[PDB]
Design a protein around this ligand. Structure first.
Ligand SMILES: Cc1cc2nc3c(=O)[nH]c(=O)nc-3n(C[C@H](O)[C@H](O)[C@H](O)COP(=O)(O)O)c2cc1C
Ligand code: SF4
Ligand code: SF4
Ligand code: SF4
Ligand code: SF4
Ligand code: FES
Ligand code: FES
Ligand SMILES: [Mg+2]
Lengths: 59, 217, 230, 431, 62, 42
């Protein structure tokens, strides 16, 4: 259960798991996450900017 | 159980707005007789009769036929599409020459309607939603057709064949494919919904006019 | 002349022909709804607005039932709450699990009314219905698996925009909303179906995936593209 | 007092079974079209009072006072046309009486249309006949042509100075369009989805005009009541359940048939007499559905002493409905039969409103799992709850009628459901 | 990221009354622009109008 | 005689029997009421 450095995961096929839903950004207490998204070339709902300020995050 | 028939239209060479359809002059006379059964300003009330007449003329309902009905009745083509897709007696796909519709609801299911369906399937060598390779027979399941006391029964082009057995339905299919038209009605020797053992009612001649008439009336 | 009706026992004078929903609105109670729009005609099909009259054994559709003299409307009664829970249960039983990938997101009437009037658990142990998506132009994106068949877009299209190319094809649980043909719903008033759709079935295509409702700041200004001054 | 053993001199629907001529000559050989002009001259109030005294109730499902309904439509004109809509969309599974009346007594139907239209002050009567009954509709049109040629209907009908038209409208296949407001919507060239009340059809009906929707059997028995008394009709039956009735006995019975009897004949006597009893005898009986698919079922215990009557079947947690008596013997899959009924309701659902649409699909799936035991006993009460959530929360009564068979099955054969689930669990756990 | 130099960018205050808000603005010395509350006008609804005999309110679909 | 089925006239009907009967009935009809407009869209 240890909470250390952050990571963005992928599906076993190589596709990114994140769907730009901004639930983490909404729930972040310290507002450490900045998210910007748009439809991809193939129409996927994927992020273009996913920033985490690790000096603002409270882990 | 999914019906297996979609409710969206994709243009095909055999079904597109450029498909040739138009009513015959006789059918135009029939349409003009139909339309004036409804009050002026309510010509949209004739959508079902006119669409049924178009299907009777053409054998089925293409998108061109739907558009023609809409144009004739000055009603939106989307409303015509709504009616056509809602009502199950409208064939939006080509069907066989004889459209066997086996009623499979519980009153017909209690008697061996599954036997009738299996006999039809073996006789024609088709499934319960397919059409014979010679475009002669189409087989479908339907709900109650109003002849429950005469179960099991089928409907083949607005003709009821009732009190059926596998041999009876096989004979009916043989007669249809030969060319002859079988006589609709019960196949068990009954004429109508009367009990098979004998008449338990209406055994005496009917009483004539003015039998139990009120004093003043 | 005005007739006296009661909402939760509170008297209110309403004009004849006023509905239960409008009486509750007068006393300040907003009855839940999915198909009712005050700018459109009354449909009464989503059945979400069912309320209890004090002596009536049967619930009434508040959006379509005119009030009678001396009617007591029990908006927060057990029967009304159970009716709302059942209707929401059916809606979410056939609804898809698309909330994170859905642009309606945090401004969805299905989510909010489920959190306020529905249950917190599901009893649906079967499979869900998936519906093919239509294409009605480059402005409105259609994901019709999320449609709740409320016929807001159809009524708006016809009555307001004078365009009669929207409707329901088929019947039963397989009833679908669309054109039945590859036709683009092109009109000068096409985005209002995006606005009035309570679910993410109709969403803005240029705005797709870009933002979420809680992030946005609202600036109340006027329109300059024409001389109406919207 | 006992009821039954109706006499042929008192049976209203002669020419049933089609053993006599159904034409105008054959109908006039019987009592049809006799002093109809005198009845019309007596006028609306006399006809309405005669119907009210006869105490006739709706013969196409929910039994309401037809006198009260026609009095509802007896309001003064307000500059709009007036219509009687005759329901002949016999979509209820188990029912053939309307088919028999149309095919064998079309002149009785037409005379009843004329009498009811005069009572309601109606200019026209639209007989909405289901599209499967093509031959019945053609016979009806032939009889209507005969009536028009003889001058019995049309302008100066029966030489009485009353103008009345009789049109026949053939629908397509929609058991929901069988419903009265859906019938009205289908006449107007629409999908056929039931309306919300108010407005009631007696105030805003087809084309927006005042219309009264009445069953074929009701309108057909109207002129016989008019020519006869209505003290007589009230004499036949119980106090608040008067007259004769057409019963369609079908299913696991020796002689499936349609017969006419009194309105309070016991079910056991009716089955044993007019239908030859159950196939394996009365001891082989398992369940009976007395009013078509909408009404719940009753076990042999209830069927042992029950009266084929509105109130009598209401006291038995059931309903009379269309008096379609479906018989199921001990050697039947009752769960499969009820599941097939629910599948019928799923297919014959207009899909307008959420409770019936989604919940009926859900109940169809749950019953389909039930018939094979692929479920748990905790889902029986959940199914009951969802059926109760469908009932009473729908626009029309199809949602209510889709829950009553489920409720009856759960109420009377819960042990069978639990035993089948246990058997399935044993079968799958052995793997 | 999006930068700012305005302290009062995120400051929104809630008041129960236009008079209360105006009083607060006046005592705090900021300029203020007041917008009158817009409430929807009452509308007459009828389900029976969807099936009018002679009026255009009759609907072509349900 | 009550032993013969007299409803045998319906083993002759064709596709347009109902509509031809409707056409024949046209002459016997009476003028239809008018809503005052050609269509609800007018
Ligand atoms: C042939 C027929 C079919 C009917 N089907 C339905 C139906 O599917 N659903 C429903 O709620 N009512 C149904 N009804 C009942 C009607 O809504 C309505 O109560 C009836 O037609 C009125 O006739 P009555 O006054 O003679 O009873 C049906 C009635 C008839 C006669
Ligand atoms: S936006 Fe955040 S919560 Fe949503 S999918 Fe991406 S990482 Fe997960
Ligand atoms: S429409 Fe609403 S409930 Fe449905 S997926 Fe989108 S946010 Fe969720
Ligand atoms: S697409 Fe939206 S507005 Fe249209 S019927 Fe469906 S839920 Fe309602
Ligand atoms: S209960 Fe079912 S059949 Fe009746 S209006 Fe609702 S969706 Fe249609
Ligand atoms: S159940 Fe088959 S005809 Fe009615
Ligand atoms: S808001 Fe009333 S039923 Fe939809
Ligand atoms: Mg939307």
């Amino acid at each position: 259960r240890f909470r250390g450095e952050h990571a963005l995961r992928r599906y076993p096929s190589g596709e990114e798991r994140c769907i730009a839903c901004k639930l983490c950004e909404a729930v972040c207490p310290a507002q450490a996450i900045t998210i910007e998204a748009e439809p991809r070339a193939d129409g996927s709902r994927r992020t273009t900017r996913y920033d985490i300020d690790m000096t603002k995050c409270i882990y | 159980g999914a019906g297996g028939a979609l409710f969206v239209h994709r243009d095909t060479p055999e079904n597109n707005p450029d498909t040739p359809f138009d009513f015959t002059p006789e059918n135009y006379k029939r349409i003009e007789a139909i339309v004036k059964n409804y009050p002026e300003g309510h010509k949209a009330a004739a959508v079902l009769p006119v669409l049924d007449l178009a299907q009777r003329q053409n054998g089925w309902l293409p998108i061109s036929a739907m558009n023609k009905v809409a144009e004739i009745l000055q009603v939106p083509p989307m409303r015509v599409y709504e009616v056509a897709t809602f009502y199950t007696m409208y064939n939006r796909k080509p069907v066989g020459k004889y459209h066997i519709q086996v009623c499979t609801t519980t009153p017909c299911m209690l008697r061996n309607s599954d036997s009738i369906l299996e006999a039809i399937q073996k006789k024609l060598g088709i499934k319960v939603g397919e059409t014979t390779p010679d475009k002669l027979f189409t087989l479908i399941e339907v709900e109650c057709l109003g002849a429950c006391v005469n179960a099991p029964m089928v409907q083949i082009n607005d003709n009821y064949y009732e009190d059926l057995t596998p041999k009876d339905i096989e004979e009916i299919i043989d007669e249809l494919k030969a060319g002859k038209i079988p006589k609709p009605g019960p196949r068990s020797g009954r004429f109508s919904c009367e009990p098979a053992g004998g008449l338990t009612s209406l055994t005496e001649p009917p009483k004539g006019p003015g039998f139990g008439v009120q004093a003043g009336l | 002349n005005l007739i006296e009706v009661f909402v939760d026992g509170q008297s209110v004078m309403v004009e004849p022909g006023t509905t239960v929903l409008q009486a509750c609105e007068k006393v300040g109670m907003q009855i839940p709804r999915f198909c009712y729009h005050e700018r459109l005609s009354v449909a009464g099909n989503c059945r979400m607005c069912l309320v209890e009259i004090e002596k009536a054994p049967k619930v009434v559709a508040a959006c379509a039932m005119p009030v009678m003299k001396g009617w007591n409307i029990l908006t927060n009664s057990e029967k009304s709450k159970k009716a709302r829970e059942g209707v929401m249960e059916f809606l979410l039983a056939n609804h898809p699990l698309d909330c994170p990938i859905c642009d309606q997101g945090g401004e969805c009437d299905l989510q909010d009314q489920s959190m306020m009037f529905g249950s917190d658990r599901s009893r649906f142990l079967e499979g869900k219905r998936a519906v093919e998506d239509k294409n009605i132009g480059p402005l409105v994106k259609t994901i019709m698996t999320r449609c709740i068949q409320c016929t807001r877009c159809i009524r708006f299209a016809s009555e307001i925009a004078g365009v009669d190319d929207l409707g329901t094809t088929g019947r039963g649980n397989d009833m679908q909303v669309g054109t039945y043909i590859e036709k683009m719903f092109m009109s000068e008033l096409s985005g209002n179906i995006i606005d009035i759709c309570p679910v993410g079935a109709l969403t803005s295509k240029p705005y797709a995936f870009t933002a979420r409702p809680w992030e946005t700041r609202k600036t109340e200004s006027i329109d300059v593209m024409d001389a109406v001054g919207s | 007092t006992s009821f039954g053993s109706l006499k042929d001199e008192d049976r209203i629907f002669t020419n049933l079974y089609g053993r006599h001529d159904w034409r105008l000559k054959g109908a006039q050989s019987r009592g049809d079209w006799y002093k109809t002009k005198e009845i019309l001259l007596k006028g609306p109030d006399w006809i309405l009072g005669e119907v009210k005294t006869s105490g006739l109730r709706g013969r196409g499902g929910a039994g309401f006072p037809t006198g009260l309904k026609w009095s509802f439509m007896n309001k003064p004109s307000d500059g709009r046309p007036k219509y009687l809509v005759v329901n002949a969309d016999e979509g209820e599974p188990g029912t053939c009486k309307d088919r028999e009346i149309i095919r064998h007594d079309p002149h009785k139907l037409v005379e009843g249309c004329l009498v009811g239209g005069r009572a309601m002050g109606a200019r026209a009567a639209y007989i909405y006949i289901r599209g499967e009954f093509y031959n019945e509709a053609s016979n009806l049109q032939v009889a209507i042509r005969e009536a028009y040629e003889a001058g019995l209907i049309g302008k100066n009908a029966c030489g009485s100075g009353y103008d009345f038209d009789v049109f026949v409208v053939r629908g397509a296949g929609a058991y929901i369009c069988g419903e009265e407001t859906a019938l009205i919507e289908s006449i107007e060239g629409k999908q056929g989805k039931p309306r919300l009340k108010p407005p009631f059809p007696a105030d805003v009906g087809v084309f927006g005009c005042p219309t009264t929707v009445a069953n074929v059997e009701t309108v057909a028995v109207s002129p016989t009541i008019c020519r006869r008394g209505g003290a007589w009709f009230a004499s036949f039956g119980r106090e608040r359940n008067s007259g004769t009735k057409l019963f369609n006995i079908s299913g696991h019975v020796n002689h499936p048939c349609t017969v006419e009897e009194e309105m309070s004949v016991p079910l056991k006597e009716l089955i044993e007499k007019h239908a030859g009893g159950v196939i394996g005898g009365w001891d082989n009986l398992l369940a009976v559905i007395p009013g078509g698919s909408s009404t719940p079922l009753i076990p042999k215990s209830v069927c042992e002493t029950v009266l084929m009557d509105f109130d009598a079947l209401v006291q038995a947690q059931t309903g009379l409905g269309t008096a379609a008596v479906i018989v199921m013997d001990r050697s039947t899959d009752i769960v499969k039969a009820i599941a097939r009924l629910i599948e019928f309701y799923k297919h014959e659902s207009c899909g307008q409103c959420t409770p019936c649409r989604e919940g009926v699909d859900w109940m169809n799936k749950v019953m389909a799992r039930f018939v094979k035991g692929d479920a748990r006993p905790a889902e029986i009460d959940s199914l009951w709850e969802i059926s109760k959530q469908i009932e009473g929360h729908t626009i029309c009564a199809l949602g209510d009628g889709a829950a009553w068979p489920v409720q009856g099955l759960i109420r009377h054969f819960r042990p069978e459901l639990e035993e089948r689930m246990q058997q399935f669990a044993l079968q799958h756990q052995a793997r | 990221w999006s930068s700012t130099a305005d302290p009062l960018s995120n400051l929104v205050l809630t008041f129960s009354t236009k008079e209360d808000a105006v009083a607060f603005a006046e005592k705090n010395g900021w300029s203020f622009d007041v917008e009158e509350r817009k409430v929807p006008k009452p509308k007459s609804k009828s389900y029976g109008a969807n099936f009018s005999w002679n009026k255009r309110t009759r609907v072509s679909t349900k | 005689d009550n032993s013969t089925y007299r409803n045998l006239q319906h083993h002759e009907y064709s596709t347009y029997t109902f509509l031809d009967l409707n056409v024949e009935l046209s002459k016997f009809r009476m003028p239809q009421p008018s809503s005052g407009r050609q269509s609800p869209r007018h």
